[PDB]
Subunit: 270 residues, 5 copies
């Protein structure tokens, strides 16, 4: 980014010294065409940011739903089966493993320490064996519920009430996968990013006639505004990207683990 700003000031000085030689040749750059162009580019950057922002908000809503559905499902297990503490403890394990597994899957990092921390090793091997480990964890949680239903402890209705929450988590997994696997067609976005780059390099040659020595200052102010618009659009396109802020994901996984522990009577020391 600062490379393009500094390249901007040097095309500014090139513009200044080169300026007047080409102009008497009949080589003119005026401000009005570039103002037409830049206003068009700015409108497109508004919309492109709107889209990227939507993708960011969607990632945040999906994770929020992890917290809601996992909270609600443990609430249901306590309210409906208060005495099945072993089942509570097992299911809570799978729910926390699911959150961490999801975060590692999206960020493309190794889930093995979190899995091995939370789950028996037979099931950690079953999970790491699958090419879709988060989905497998959802399956295993489903098995705990379905076993409680075979054993008579849940009816089909209360089983159904919890099955809904496992559907809420399946909705989260697929949504996050789509958000991580494919970004908005950059087909238009790359074309627009290059147009922005060319616009900012040519800008000093369009401004020098008006601003003389002030050309590099105003030129980098304008170029800075535009390049920030384009780069924030790039950063928001990609909530799970390789250079993303991992703090709110890490914070979300920790919050839900703390909630489920504090919830099952395991958080407050005896």
């Amino acid at each position: 980014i600062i490379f393009r700003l500094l390249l901007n000031v040097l095309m500014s000085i090139i513009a200044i010294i080169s300026y007047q030689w080409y102009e008497q040749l009949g080589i003119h750059l005026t401000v009005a065409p570039f103002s037409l162009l830049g206003i068009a580019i700015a409108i497109f950057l508004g919309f492109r940011n709107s889209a990227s922002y939507s993708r960011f908000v969607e990632a945040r809503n999906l994770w929020g739903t992890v917290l809601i559905a996992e909270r609600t499902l443990v609430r249901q297990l306590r309210n409906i089966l208060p005495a099945e503490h072993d089942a509570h403890r097992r299911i809570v394990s799978y729910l926390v493993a699911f959150s961490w597994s999801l975060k590692h899957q999206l960020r493309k990092t190794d889930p093995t320490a979190d899995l091995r921390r939370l789950l028996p090793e037979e099931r950690v091997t079953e999970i790491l064996a699958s090419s879709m480990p988060t989905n497998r964890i959802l399956l295993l949680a489903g098995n705990e519920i379905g076993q409680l239903r075979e054993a008579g402890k849940l009816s089909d209705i209360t089983y159904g009430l919890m099955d809904n929450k496992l559907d809420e988590l399946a909705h989260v997994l697929g949504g996050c996968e789509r958000l991580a696997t494919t970004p908005v067609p950059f087909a238009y976005t790359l074309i627009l990013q290059r147009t922005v780059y060319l616009f900012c390099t040519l800008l000093p040659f369009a401004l020098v006639g008006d601003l003389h020595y002030m050309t590099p200052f105003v030129s980098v102010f304008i170029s800075y505004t535009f390049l920030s618009a384009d780069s924030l659009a790039e950063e928001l396109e990609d909530p799970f990207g390789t250079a993303a802020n991992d703090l709110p994901l890490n914070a979300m996984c920790n919050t839900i683990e703390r909630n489920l522990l504090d919830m099952t009577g395991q958080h407050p020391l005896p």
Copy 2:
């Protein structure tokens, strides 16, 4: 804050007086500032402020909506209790005290304030202790109300279906909780508003210099008009920053909690 915008309006007037005074020296030295580049930059900044303001506004509308749903789902949970168990008035009173405690607690959570007093007013001390030990008191309150209807289900007074009908309302509330906690911890990205406010400040400070060649002694008036408009647009979005905050523009959470409590008390024959 109003003091920021009047103070930087102040400063803009100053800047334009510097621009007026120094214009004579401006042309010999090689400096020229024309209006057209600042028209391009200003229109772009305005486009970006439109979109950002749209983000802020929609954050504030969502916060108001979530609270609307607190009132809706709590009203109908009490309605289901009365319609399904007309005789079970002890459960009526206890669940109403948990729903009311949930609302006040949500307010305290969002406001980062201590809910001990409201809890003690509505609940027996043992439950207050249980709720305060939790890292999420509103969650523990939803769990306790759920124990009320769950015990009703174990006594055979609720079937699995009517139990489930009320359980869903505790779902409507968990989603409100998640929504509010999400909004609280997820602002409009700081890069946006910080870069935007730096750009607006620099833009307004530089503007009178671009105006002076054209307006001469009119530079301060026009410059301050334009700057007022822009500083208004920028500050308004950060004035919708925390809808759960304390300020004239922020949601009146205390009044809304009183409306909720009044509603739930009205529905259970209480004064």
Copy 3:
């Protein structure tokens, strides 16, 4: 409206600007068009977004009222389909749904619902309803009681009770939503600063145009002013959809439509 005033005041501002154009440079004041281009275009962006929010606020009100008709229609359909012989319960529940609509309309218009309520319900319930600070919620509660006593009497199962309970929820979200809209406006900081800015812009504009247009200034200025005043006025015009203005929902017509729909479904 205040538009015709501000337009005439704009004509006067423009005449002043013409007659005062002489002493302009004598005073040292120079005013071009380009700064006002910048500012007017920005104001117009902000007005387009603002009017957008106002518009969506109006749309949501029309939608909430649309859901009343949908949910009461299908609660009645479920009554006739699940208990086709229970006409006395038909009449009681329909009178509650219709009363809910008119009560909602009166509460939003801040009028007394008593005539409609007593026209629809027994006095014994009407007093319970108006004894409450939330009459429309109380009416929802009572309709719930009709359904619930049907369930206790074995006439509805828990399942078919639940399928009607869901429609009661559809109406609770409508009530809460309308009450929210009625007390939650698009932040009037928008509208106020924007309106002042539109006005000051409209009065200063001819002084910035006279140097370039001379005697033509009043026409271009009134045109531009009309456009900006028009947009600002529309945002103020769509702010309260539940009111009685020409641009507001025909709430009375809508309540008549709901009531005739449910009476047609019940033979009555």
Copy 4:
């Protein structure tokens, strides 16, 4: 394109008047620069952008509601086949009500006579019942609901499976409600008609402010600009009524025909 080409060539006329009256600008003392009209024209374009957004939202919603007719009717028939596979007389009756519902909804939105379509589909007794209601699409929904209600009363459906079908009837009621709200409530006219008149006036005055610059080009760029602006305006006006009959409105007859072909796919036959 009836009104708009009339106004386009009327704009060629106004440009010609502007040209031959540029003769008199020097002597009458009238400058008319382009910058004030660029400002005003950009404001008008912004408002036309937003207005087209509102119109497009109405049109996309209308299209979606109709898509929900096909989805809900399809799954209701599917449930009837999966739950009561042998009840073909019920199959046929309910399907006839649902197809009737599509056509009835279309005629209601278009304000046309449904009698023919109803008669092609249902017995004449039910046709007169439906025609007697002032809400015939709603009455058709009530009648589909009576078919399901009977299947329940006869013990052929339990309350669960009855409810699974009742939900789809609710999906159709939200469609009816949504179309009625769209067809009877438009976008307010403080926008539409003040903005439309504003666009007209701007277009007629533009060439007068452009002769100063373009002299004989002013009819060409004036007509170009009026083309794009009048297009924006009339497009918004067309799409705000998406159940209308303009060329850019929804093809409701093709949608009803698709729905019919679906539910009656191979004389209504289906694998057990």
Copy 5:
């Protein structure tokens, strides 16, 4: 950046450079004629066109996003239908395998239908020939696949191995898929209103044709270069709608439906131990 669109931008860009040459070597006979073109009207026109392009392309992009989302729902709903089968009927593997083959068949059939290709080989790889016959005799084969999966769980309900409740839990997923099928068919028959794209392509075409005659008086010999830059911005922005016209198509920025169907199949096989 695919076939039919790129050809048009290159041609209109060549049209542009040529119009700019003519403009340059003919500007000298302007004021003598009375034809004059200034930048300011074309700034008005260009900025109006750009606003309308912004809105339009916002529609096109939303349409692409919806197609992607509908396909993601296929994955989610089939995943959970299989999960439910395992958790409610764990011993009923035969039924598991049949229902899985119908769900995979549904995905492949939806791909073929949206590309208008022949589903017969995929269907015969997944299903017994009688089933393929039933499916392909329908005028709506993918919907018919849904009806057959409904029959599988309906038989499970008849045999008492599913209660009405749990039968209903899987029925809701079958109409999670019915929502997908209707949505794809609607998108496939409902573009962004062609009036938008056609009028926009025309005003952009004319605008880019007249631009160099409006820029020449300012830019002299620079006219071709920025005229082609500006024309690039407008032409490619106007091309976006056609790029995103066919999200179910086969181009590079067209959705990767075959890999998505492969992924769905691998997911269900993984879930059922095959």
